Design a protein around this ligand. Structure first.
Ligand SMILES: [Cl-]
Ligand SMILES: [Mg+2]
Lengths: 244, 243, 231, 195, 250, 240, 241, 235, 111
């Protein structure tokens, strides 16, 4: 019968590893680098677009950075199509929580549920896992500003600063060097860009090959604002830090 | 390669090797025939007497569908029974909805589509039988032969099993020598002869003859078994011809 | 070789190897004999034990007051099939107030075994059965094989070294068929038949298993001291 | 079941609930506690159809306790009330709806404010300074309209509550065998033993 | 019986590649060239009509398809896969949008729904990926004109102009030289015909070329009058005659 | 539905998928459980290749199943969440029907049953997780410590360890733990647990987690400085 | 190499099972041809009855799908009949649901979509057949639409199918180059059938008796097949010219 | 790979035969049937000295008149015991009587072959089911994952089974007392066990008509161990 | 509206002795004021020395007896031809009756 053609996606290796999860991570390591940095007064999300063409429409484009609700955003690394499936699920889960409790969903709860979905694809169903790694950047009134990451294994962890995708080894070393706890948002913006500028496989880092976003309490009095940077705004912030 | 390991897989020729392998099982089985006649059809089959311990006349192989259709087959006997069980369900639902008994061509396609369906998936095995069947309906007499692939045609005479070539040759002579037609009672006698002649290809064990028939005049359009005096008369006719 | 992975696959010569391997399980099983006259039908079964401390595996099963079988091969498969026969015999009684014909019993077993040989996932039954019974057309004996093939016989035997008993019955055919109105003599012929399949071992009191059905005799099984008469 | 009251004061929420359990012409019990603790700072009283009341209360209790263990965090009274309302809102269009009315009294530790929610079996939620279910309201609401002040103490709230029970004991047809009173505040939930 | 293939036929290889998606893209590479160019006041999509036989009527086979009155689609790769995608794309525009909001979906969202369908064929049980890349041109009130590409993986990207299929590499280079942000629709049609002549080998006329635009509203193509807000479809398929007129002043 | 029998017997009588799940446990960070006279202590390793972590929000290694029972683990982290969730739900369900919190033996038996079900169910792989379940039964002062593993077998332990280099720390506990006289106090039990982890860990900084469970739902997690004091005390006594 | 057993992509972007289904098409060794007149659409096919024991009346590869639509198949008869039965059911359901007779081209698309599904879904194999649908459509007039195992379909001015299809194709191509039109400029269907047989004789280079051919004719409001004597009458007309 | 319910060329189910190998790796379990009762005894086999041996539950009650001992992948036995207990209690509910030991065993063995592509694989554990009923008296059954069960006068399963079975062959007779049977299980267990036999690493149990199924205490077993050593030294 | 029940009348009587037991019943079957049969037995030998009657609505009574007779048959198959005790039969019948608690057998049963 059909047994002949089954890849058996949800099994262990003799070493005790999940083949498909390991290979999905190998896929993600070729995707454009995404960096998250958490400051005391906000969070920065920076991401490098995958080898851009000059005729690509840049302003009306969304590849790396997505909005989950008003308080939470994600940076993507891997298959975009796979990520969008998970993003719409996450968006729905957030609205279910709000409908049930009349309160915005705590960041970790959203992250756990999305990570639990990925876990399921590694243990049962016989389907391939989602070839996606997220950086979650969000705020709630319990823990304040929070950075998380999840990967195809369904395992998630919290971070002060973190990178996913390509050159994470080199990127993580640079972040570990210059990061400190009393850091401000504007400093974190500069660190994020400087790190990408050194770890990039491109010749020079330009505005058209970047997506950028901040989550500050920079609105008026005790409330959070999400800023998905426009092309011209990335151009200005790149000049202001002296990269171009 | 490996194209022959799974059912429903096309080979580079455009062939389904699993179906061709099922045909080999049919070729291995005992001989069975079908003869179309003036106003009906006649069926006959070779029953190998494996042992003295087999009860004569009590291992019946020819099967009836509805009250007007006869079915006989060569190959895997259980597979044939499964096909007839389906045939009986198909014929029952036709009569249920449309009142009239199922026509033979209509019935032929019902089996055809069912057998063909068992060549579409790797989760099922093709049928290991060629089935000779037919009967009498509103449009007269019809004889059919169905194969593992789902392929079937109408026939003047039909044969399958280990002695199919011997039987086919003998059938072709009847078609040539009787262009105007063969009678029902004649066809019963000829059927006996052809089974006896086809037994030469399976002559280690001696055998038991079994005949059935549908005829508008002789059996009133219904399927019946040939027994008693009419059976012995046909056996004697066959015995006289081999010598 | 490459065509014995499952039952859904034919070999290049048109063979079903999984069905043939199931047939092989019967040959490993202990011998059992069946024979009938015109008035009665008898089952004789050599039971097998694990060792001297163990009991002897029961070979004969009752299906109705007028029908029952003996098994050879996988016993759990015989339990599944005998249970199905019990239900079918019972359906015939409750719905139609009619004792199930022994011939129809065979037809039903054939069709049940067949479905397992044409579908992916499942497997063939790994047991052979000898069904005896007395119905409206007198005494009957059937031989079931898990290929689906069912055969009505005067006498037969299945299991290891069954060829010895089968040859004896083939010689004795004319004698035992006319043992009418005499249960003990028909059993004696069956006990003598199964004896032709014995090697090194002989028939003891907790080794032999006999069953009988007939004109004025319900299907009843004899074990223990009740079979001491026939040794 | 029958009488359940609630009063929100300056620093606490007070719930009064009748002790009688009647079936037919017999008072089967006169010491029944018609409430469940959902979390350390959230209490729910209930009244309605026999069986349904306790089954529903305990079902909600289990769910809130499960949440507490999972997140290692207490849900706000507002959040619990919204969860309860949705469960009743589902129920009303079910094959057999829960016929249970509830009051949810809780102290929000983040806001440092007491909160009282009244929810009927249809899933109709309202936040109130004082609340009641059943025929009780027909006496107590007008009484509290007159005597209630928003800046009252817990002791003043208990005297205000005594005034309600006295009126109910005077004008209600049925003997409800007094009430069990419980206070919800910053320090949690405690029962007044002498009322 | 029954679909026993409940497991993924597309899986990650040790190198991290998704084989079937890569192979699907290879099938797209073999396919005939198609392209799309975005202008200031419109969008153009075009492709060659590769005829299987001269006896075959190439008019009956439509490579450029209307999805909504303001959205059109063209492809490169396997035609049958494209045909069913158009059927599913048209239906999803109604079920998941128009029947809810009483209006047609914007280009980006319809594209998103098509991408979802193609992604599921990459992960669901017992199926292979679609062997096509789509170019979807469209207009909507709040986003204006837009052009999108959709790949077998389910990934989609917005383009100012692009090409896919056989001679896409050369065609994209040609478009980079000619494209500017001040192009009028007629100029974009002119460039589309120039770009396509490079990839086409045999006959080059209105009968072998299929070309459609997303431009101004067409009241004459609406089919009725009386409702002022309803002004007609922006999608228009250029006729065989209309193409030949522009090939003279080429 | 996906039906494939992934966990199956091999010619030598082994279920490789269950045995390979044990390898995943062997890869996981070390976890240790030691029970004293009036308490149980759960110690856990945290690998130090991860700096720039946020320990406030990062999932803790020891999880509360109820107010009186805790669960630590070694192996796949994502898998452990599924077992913990199920256990937490069953804990509340038991309170609802029996009107009494679960015993530690019952909760262990449930979790072990779930793990077993995944070793002979179609379409699923076994949990790559072994657990240490500890606590005190309702109205009982006798300490309880149980272990589970992917196969589904479970048992009670005076002291036990699981995870990477667990055979080294088990060797330590086997000679250092006296059955006749278990750690009489909380301090003694915590020290023995920290000592055992110091055989394997590396540094006693932010690598060791300690959780102490006492009778009547008295559970508390130790902070960095509190644990560091044990590390400082043990090293000074060692230099002798 | 299991990518050649089921319908998934090979490294070079090919579906080998679909390609091998195309080769099953010619397993019967029969050639078919279809042309359009002014008022009609004619389809002809070779009829080969090798066995003497066969009932020749039951040997047919032309099917009456609906009253208006006819279908000829190139491929094995089991798959041919499978496709025919489904097409009949689809045409009937269409009429019931939408209140008018299913057009030839719409049925072709529907059957092509079904064929496409078999190329994408693994458990279903492709049918090893090429379906040629013919009718006189009430909107589009004389119509020929053809389907294959790949799920491809297109309309035709005329067409041919089988082992010697290419010889027949070019023969027809050269005629339409000469006539300068899309169809057979002829009034009666009888002479359009005569054209079809004549040009098949020229292309294949063989002569035909009455039992060597099989003819289907589509006119307005009915499709019908010709008997042996109807063909014989037609063969006599060709010979006497 | 290959089907789960596949036959070998010798006519045996691969998976069933492989599960029998798993049972051979399991700890020893012995049962002896007498006219005064049926005795069940097992090797506990603790993997480490820190493991509290009294938590090793390899002898188990099904009903008051039926007991059970196991050997092999013991985790697999939990659902078998659960089914047995339910079957026993359910029969009592439907028929107001104790259920026959044979009928109970048959019900358990029906689960055995309910695997394929139902559960994914056979059970990897063998059971010794001992009990008493009014009809057939004291009985001992050996239930395998093949779905087959044999009644035994005495039986050993596990790693030391073939050596212990040969010993039981010589020692068993139809006039054994309960006390004699208790010592005989201890004697044979001590012979096949790796580590030295004592009250902590071995467990005894019995089922009698009068008192029903009882697992022995570590104090009671210890005295039987001491009584056994003295009797062997006495000649 | 369709009424699924009817009253077939009749009456039955059971008495127990020291070493015996009787179960009697009249042989008349009726509907309304008509007689259907003057001899239609409703006390049956069900095997294992158990006699049984289900009086009231005959269709339900015959169905129940039929089911219990069948229950006795399967008790033998499943439990090695063991004799069904009168107390065990009673409990089995309770489950037959209660299985239709929400669409009852309109009968008074005596064994
Ligand atoms: Cl369709
Ligand atoms: Mg209200």
């Amino acid at each position: 019968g059909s047994r002949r053609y089954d890849s058996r996606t949800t099994i262990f290796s003799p070493e005790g590893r999940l083949y498909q999860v390991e290979y999905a991570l190998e896929s993600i390591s070729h995707a454009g680098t995404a960096i998250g940095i958490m400051a005391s007064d906000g969070i920065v999300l920076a991401a490098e677009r995958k080898v851009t063409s000059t005729l690509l429409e840049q302003d009306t484009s969304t590849e790396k950075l997505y909005k989950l609700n008003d308080k939470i955003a994600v940076a993507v690394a891997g298959l975009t199509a796979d990520a969008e499936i998970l993003i719409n699920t996450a968006r729905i889960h957030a609205q279910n929580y709000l409908k049930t409790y009349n309160e915005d969903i705590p960041v970790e709860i959203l992250v756990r549920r999305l990570s639990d979905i990925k876990q399921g694809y590694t243990q049962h169903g016989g389907l391939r896992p989602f070839g996606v790694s997220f950086i979650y950047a969000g705020y709630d009134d319990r823990y304040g500003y929070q950075l998380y990451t999840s990967n195809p294994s369904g395992n998630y962890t919290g971070w002060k600063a973190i990178s996913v995708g390509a050159n994470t080894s080199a990127a993580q070393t640079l972040l570990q060097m210059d990061y400190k706890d009393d850091m401000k948002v504007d400093d974190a913006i500069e660190l994020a860009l400087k790190t990408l500028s050194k770890t990039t496989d491109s010749s020079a880092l330009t505005y058209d090959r970047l997506e950028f976003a901040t989550i500050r309490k920079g609105a008026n009095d005790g409330e959070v604002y999400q800023k998905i940077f426009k092309p011209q705004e990335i151009k200005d912030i790149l000049v202001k830090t002296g990269i171009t | 390669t490996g194209y022959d390991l799974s059912n429903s897989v096309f080979s580079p020729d455009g062939r389904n090797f699993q179906v061709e392998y099922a045909v080999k099982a049919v070729e291995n089985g005992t001989t069975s025939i079908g003869i179309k006649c003036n106003d009906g059809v006649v069926f006959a089959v070779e029953k190998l007497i494996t042992s003295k311990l087999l009860v004569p006349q009590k291992n019946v192989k020819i099967q009836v569908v509805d009250r007007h259709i006869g079915c006989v087959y060569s190959g895997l006997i259980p597979d044939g029974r499964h096909l007839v069980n389906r045939g009986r369900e198909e014929a029952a639902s036709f009569k249920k909805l449309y009142k009239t008994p199922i026509p033979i061509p209509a019935f032929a396609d019902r089996l055809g589509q069912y057998v063909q369906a068992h060549t579409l998936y790797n989760s099922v095995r093709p049928f290991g039988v060629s089935t000779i069947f037919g009967g009498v309906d509103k449009n007269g007499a019809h004889l059919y032969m169905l194969e593992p692939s789902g392929s079937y045609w109408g026939y003047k005479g039909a044969a399958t099993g280990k002695g199919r070539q011997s039987a086919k040759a003998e059938l072709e002579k009847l078609v040539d020598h009787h262009p105007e037609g063969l009678s029902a009672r004649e066809a019963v006698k000829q059927a006996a002869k052809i089974i006896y002649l086809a037994h030469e290809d399976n002559k280690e064990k001696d055998f038991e003859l079994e005949i059935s028939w549908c005829s508008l005049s002789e059996t009133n359009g219904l399927h019946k078994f040939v027994k008693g005096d009419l059976l012995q008369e046909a056996i004697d006719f066959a015995q006289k011809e081999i010598n | 070789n490459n065509y014995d992975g499952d039952t859904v696959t034919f070999s290049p010569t048109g063979r079903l190897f999984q069905v043939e391997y199931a047939l092989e399980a019967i040959k490993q099983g202990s011998v059992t004999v069946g024979l009938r006259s015109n008035t009665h039908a008898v089952l004789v079964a050599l039971k097998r034990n694990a060792d001297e401390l163990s009991s002897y595996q029961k070979k004969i099963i009752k299906c109705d007051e007028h029908m029952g079988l003996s098994l050879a091969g996988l016993a759990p498969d015989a339990r599944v099939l005998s249970n199905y026969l019990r239900q079918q015999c019972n359906y015939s009684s409750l719905v139609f107030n009619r004792k199930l014909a022994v011939e129809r019993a065979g037809h039903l077993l054939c069709d049940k075994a067949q479905k397992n040989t044409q579908s992916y996932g499942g497997r063939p039954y790994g047991v052979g059965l000898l069904i005896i019974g007395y119905d409206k057309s007198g005494a009957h004996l059937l031989e079931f094989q898990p290929s689906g093939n069912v055969t009505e016989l005067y006498g037969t035997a299945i299991g290891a070294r069954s060829q010895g008993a089968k040859t004896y019955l083939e010689r004795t055919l004319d004698t035992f068929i006319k043992i009418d109105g005499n249960p003990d003599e028909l059993i004696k012929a069956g006990v003598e038949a199964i004896s032709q399949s014995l090697r090194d071992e002989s028939l003891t009191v907790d080794n032999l298993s006999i069953a009988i059905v007939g004109k004025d005799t319900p299907f009843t099984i004899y074990d223990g001291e009740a079979v001491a008469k026939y040794i | 079941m029958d009488i359940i009251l609630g009063i929100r004061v300056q620093d606490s929420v007070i719930l009064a609930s009748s002790k009688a359990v009647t079936r037919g012409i017999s008072v089967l019990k006169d010491s029944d506690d018609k409430t469940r603790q959902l979390s350390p700072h959230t209490l729910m009283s209930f009244a309605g159809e026999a069986g349904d009341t306790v089954q529903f209360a305990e079902y909600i209790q289990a769910n809130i306790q499960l949440y507490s263990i999972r997140e290692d965090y207490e849900l706000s009274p507002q959040a619990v009330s919204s969860f309860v309302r949705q469960e009743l809102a589902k129920s009303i269009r079910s094959r057999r709806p829960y016929q249970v009315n509830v009051l949810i009294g809780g102290y929000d530790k983040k806001k440092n404010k007491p909160e009282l929610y009244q929810i009927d079996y249809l899933g109709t939620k309202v936040e109130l300074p004082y609340g009641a279910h059943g025929y009780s309201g027909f006496y107590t609401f007008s009484l509290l309209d007159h005597h209630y002040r928003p800046d009252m103490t817990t002791e003043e709230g208990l005297d205000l509550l005594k005034l309600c029970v006295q009126e109910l004991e005077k004008r209600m047809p049925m003997d409800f065998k007094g009430v069990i009173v419980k206070i919800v505040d910053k320090d949690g939930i405690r029962q007044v033993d002498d009322f | 019986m029954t679909d026993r293939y409940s497991f993924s036929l597309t899986t990650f290889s040790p190198s991290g590649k998704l084989g079937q998606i890569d192979y699907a893209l290879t099938a797209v590479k073999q396919g005939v060239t198609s392209l799309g160019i975005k202008a200031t006041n419109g969008v153009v999509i075009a492709t060659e009509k590769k005829s299987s036989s001269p006896l075959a009527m190439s008019e009956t086979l439509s490579k450029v398809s209307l999805l909504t009155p303001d959205i059109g689609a063209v492809y490169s790769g396997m035609g049958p896969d494209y045909r069913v995608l158009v059927d599913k794309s048209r239906k999803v525009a109604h079920t998941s949008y128009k029947r809810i909001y009483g209006e047609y979906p914007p280009t980006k969202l319809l594209v998103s729904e098509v991408a979802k369908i193609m992604q599921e064929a990459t992960q669901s049980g017992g199926v292979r990926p679609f062997g096509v890349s789509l170019l979807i041109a469209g207009h909507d009130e709040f986003n204006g004109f837009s052009l999108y590409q959709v790949d077998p993986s389910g990934s989609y990207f917005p383009w100012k102009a692009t090409a896919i299929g056989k001679g896409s590499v050369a065609a994209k280079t040609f478009l980079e030289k000619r494209w500017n942000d001040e192009l009028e629709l007629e100029d974009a049609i002119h460039i589309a015909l120039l770009t396509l002549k490079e990839s086409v080998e045999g006959e080059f006329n209105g009968d072998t070329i299929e070309l459609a635009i997303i431009g101004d509203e067409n009241p004459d193509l609406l089919g009725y009058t009386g409702i002022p807000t309803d002004k007609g479809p922006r999608f228009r398929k250029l006729t065989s005659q209309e193409i030949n007129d522009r090939l003279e002043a080429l | 539905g996906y039906d494939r029998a992934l966990s199956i017997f091999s010619p030598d009588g082994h279920i490789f998928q269950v045995e390979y799940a044990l390898e995943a446990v062997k890869r996981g960070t070390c976890a240790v459980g030691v029970k004293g006279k009036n308490c149980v202590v759960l110690g856990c390793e945290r690998r130090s290749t991860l700096k720039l972590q946020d320990t406030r929000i990062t999932p803790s290694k020891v999880s509360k199943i109820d107010s009186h029972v805790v669960l630590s683990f070694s192996g796949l982290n994502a898998d452990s969440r599924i077992l913990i969730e199920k256990a937490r739900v069953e804990a509340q369900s038991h309170r609802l029907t029996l009107e009494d919190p679960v015993t530690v033996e019952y909760l262990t038996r449930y979790v072990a049953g779930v793990q077993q079900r995944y070793t002979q169910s179609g379409g699923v792989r076994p949990f790559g997780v072994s657990t240490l379940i500890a606590g005190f039964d309702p109205r009982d002062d006798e300490p309880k410590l149980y272990q589970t593993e992917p196969s589904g077998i479970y048992s009670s332990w005076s002291a036990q360890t699981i995870g990477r280099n667990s055979k080294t720390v088990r060797e330590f506990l086997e000679k250092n733990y006296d059955r006749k006289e278990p750690p009489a106090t909380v301090e003694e039990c915590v020290k023995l647990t920290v000592r055992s982890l110091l055989e394997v860990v590396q540094t006693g900084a932010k690598n060791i987690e300690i959780t102490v469970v006492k009778p009547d739902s008295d559970i508390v997690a130790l902070s960095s400085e509190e644990i560091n004091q044990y590390v400082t005390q043990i090293e000074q006594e060692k230099q002798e | 190499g299991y990518d050649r057993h089921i319908t998934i992509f090979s490294p070079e972007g090919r579906l080998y099972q679909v390609e091998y289904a195309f080769k099953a098409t010619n397993q019967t060794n029969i050639n078919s041809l279809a042309v359009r007149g002014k008022d009609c659409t004619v389809v002809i096919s070779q009829k080969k009855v090798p066995d003497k024991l066969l009932d020749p009346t039951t040997v047919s590869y032309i099917f009456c799908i609906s009253r208006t639509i006819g279908m000829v198949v190139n491929g094995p008869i089991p798959d041919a009949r499978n496709a025919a039965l489904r097409a009949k059911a689809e045409a009937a359901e269409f009429r019931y649901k939408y209140g008018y007779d299913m057009p030839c081209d719409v049925l072709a698309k529907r059957m092509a979509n079904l064929s496409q599904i078999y190329t994408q879904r693994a458990y279903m194999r492709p049918l090893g057949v090429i379906l040629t649908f013919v009718s006189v459509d009430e909107e589009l007039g004389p119509s020929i639409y053809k389907t294959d195992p790949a799920g491809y379909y297109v309309g035709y001015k005329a067409t041919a199918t089988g082992p010697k299809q290419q010889e027949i194709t070019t023969n027809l191509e050269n005629h339409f180059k000469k006539s300068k039109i899309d169809h057979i400029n002829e009034e009666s269907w009888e002479k359009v059938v005569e054209f079809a047989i004549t040009h098949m004789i020229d292309a294949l280079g063989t002569e035909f008796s009455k039992n060597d051919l099989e003819v289907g004719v589509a006119t307005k409001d009915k499709f019908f097949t010709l008997s042996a004597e109807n063909i014989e009458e037609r063969l006599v007309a060709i010979a006497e010219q | 790979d290959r089907g789960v319910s596949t036959f070998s060329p010798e006519g045996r189910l691969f998976q069933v035969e492989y599960s029998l190998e798993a049972i051979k790796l399991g700890s020893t379990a012995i049962g002896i049937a007498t006219k005064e009762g049926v005795v069940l005894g097992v090797e506990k086999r603790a993997t480490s000295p820190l493991l509290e041996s009294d938590s090793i539950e390899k002898i188990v009650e099904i009903d008051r008149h039926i007991g059970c001992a196991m050997s092999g992948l013991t985790a697999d036995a939990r659902s078998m015991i659960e089914h047995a207990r339910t079957a026993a209690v359910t029969h009592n509910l439907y028929y107001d009587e104790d259920i026959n030991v044979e009928s109970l065993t048959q019900s358990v063995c029906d689960l055995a072959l309910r695997f394929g592509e139902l559960m994914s694989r056979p059970f990897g554990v063998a059971l010794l089911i001992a009990g008493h009923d009014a009809d057939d008296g004291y009985q001992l059954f050996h239930a395998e994952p093949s779905g087959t069960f044999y009644r035994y006068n005495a039986k050993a399963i596990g790693s030391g089974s073939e050596g212990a079975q040969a010993e039981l062959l010589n020692e068993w007779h139809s006039s054994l007392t309960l006390k004699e049977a208790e010592l005989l299980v201890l004697k044979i267990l001590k012979q096949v066990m790796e580590e030295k036999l004592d009250e902590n690493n071995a467990q005894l149990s019995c089922i009698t008509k009068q008192d029903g199924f009882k697992i022995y205490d570590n104090e009671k077993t210890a005295e039987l161990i001491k009584e056994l050593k003295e009797k062997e030294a006495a000649e | 509206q369709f009424n699924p029940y009817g009253d077939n009348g009749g009456t039955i009587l059971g008495i127990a002795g020291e070493d015996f037991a009787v179960l009697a019943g009249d042989t008349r079957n009726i509907t309304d004021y008509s007689i259907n049969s003057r001899y239609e037995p409703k006390v049956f030998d069900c095997g294992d020395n158990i006699v049984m009657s289900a009086n009231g609505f005959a269709a339900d009574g015959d169905a129940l007896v039929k089911r219990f007779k069948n229950s006795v048959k399967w008790y033998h198959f499943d439990h090695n031809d063991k004799k069904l005790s009168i107390n065990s039969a009673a409990r089995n019948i309770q489950h037959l009756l209660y299985g239709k608690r929400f669409f009852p057998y309109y009968v008074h049963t005596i064994i």
